[PDB]
């Protein structure tokens, strides 16, 4: 197997706790909808994470 | 002289045989009982039937994460 470099890593990390991130976290998903339902076609549609990283 | 029975002064006391108190029998009983009971139900399902409500709320904060 072939695997991405150490860049494509290290990007900055959302560095909170669990109950701030349950904190909002209703009002969060309902209005992105873009990059994060289209990751889950980019997910169970075709498998194979390594493919999907953008 | 001095002997005991008195002239008078008695009772005497019962041989008798009573103390049947009711009671509240005979269909009273079985009617607050069951009356009771279905306060119970009653009770349940405006209980029950709204933590399942908040059940689904915390399913829900579980979903709008994990992309």
């Given at each position: 197997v072939e695997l991405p470099s150490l860049?494509?890593?290290?990007?900055?990390?959302?560095?909170?706790s669990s109950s701030v991130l349950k904190a909002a976290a209703h009002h969060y998903?309902?209005?992105?909808?873009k990059p994060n339902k289209e990751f889950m076609l980019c997910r169970w549609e075709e498998k194979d994470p390594r493919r999907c990283l953008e | 002289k001095q002997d005991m029975p008195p002239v008078g002064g008695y009772g005497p006391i019962d041989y008798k045989r009573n103390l049947?108190?009711?009671?509240?029998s005979g269909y009273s009983m079985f009617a607050v009982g069951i009356g009771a009971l279905l306060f119970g139900y009653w009770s349940m399902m405006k209980w029950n039937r709204e933590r399942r409500r908040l059940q689904i709320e915390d399913f829900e904060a579980r979903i709008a994460l994990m992309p």
């Open positions: 860049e494509d890593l290290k990007v900055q990390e959302v560095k909170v998903g309902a209005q992105c909808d | 049947p108190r009711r009671g509240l």
